[PDB]
Design a protein around this ligand. Structure first.
Ligand SMILES: O=S(=O)(O)OC[C@H]1O[C@H](O)[C@H](OS(=O)(=O)O)[C@@H](OS(=O)(=O)O)[C@@H]1OS(=O)(=O)O
Length: 217
């Protein structure tokens, strides 16, 4: 069989399932590296013994066993990297998919909040609906930027083939949010009191979730 992780269906707690699967993978990997490193040790002690006894046959053993070892390592290193990338692609797909859903639904509550307003003062509801939408888009930025961060440290290469993309995402997020704020222009009664609150909340919420940094670049 495979990991139970790949066939889930609520995705509601993806972070926890992923973080969990990642340990089961990470740990399973540590199981193998230990087994190899131990094999190396037994192999290596042997060389030290037959060192002065069979210096010719002994030495051949060292060259030989290095090739094997070197190879077995590279083999493992790849497998892990392969599996790691398989679990992430999946993860990043559900997270994006699930984030989108929040956007999708947060918008609905928003546009209803506004339609209901036309008739009667959905005042407070409109805002809490907007702030919800904002939290959703901003969470999309925070996770994206963060992915660029991990890739900047893992693959300074894979990383570069993402920047144009990251820049494209962060742009439309701002656009979508600004366009979603524009929808208030029509309710003058309401754009006068709700807007300045929601914009401050956007600047505030972004300051908390995805700050600035001074350490490095
Ligand atoms: O898999 S879940 O158990 O649903 O994830 C819960 C939270 O896990 C981390 O705190 C998550 O933090 S993270 O840095 O690892 O994304 C956090 O994301 S965040 O609130 O948007 O910041 C998650 O909160 S959630 O409401 O977005 O699901």
């Amino acid at each position: 069989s495979q990991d139970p992780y790949f066939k889930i269906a609520n995705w509601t707690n993806e972070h926890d399932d992923f973080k969990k699967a990642e340990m089961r993978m990470d740990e399973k990997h540590r199981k193998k590296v230990d087994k190899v490193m131990k094999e190396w040790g037994d192999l290596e002690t042997r060389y030290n013994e037959q060192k002065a006894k069979d210096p010719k046959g002994a030495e051949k053993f060292k060259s030989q066993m290095n090739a094997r070892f070197q190879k077995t390592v590279s083999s493992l290193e790849e497998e892990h990297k392969r599996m790691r990338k398989e679990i992430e692609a999946v993860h990043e797909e559900r997270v994006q998919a699930m984030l989108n859903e929040k956007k999708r639904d947060a918008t609905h509550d928003y546009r209803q909040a506004l339609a209901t307003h036309v008739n009667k003062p959905n005042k407070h509801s409109v805002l809490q609906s907007l702030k919800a939408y904002i939290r959703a888009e901003e969470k999309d930025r925070m996770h994206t930027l963060n992915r660029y961060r991990h890739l900047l440290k893992a693959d300074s290469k894979e990383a570069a083939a993402y920047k144009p993309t990251v820049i494209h995402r962060l742009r439309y997020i701002d656009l979508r949010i600004n366009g979603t704020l524009a929808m208030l222009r029509d309710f003058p009664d309401l754009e006068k009191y709700v807007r300045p609150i929601a914009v401050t909340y956007w600047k505030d919420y972004r300051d908390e979730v995805s700050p600035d940094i001074s350490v490095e670049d």
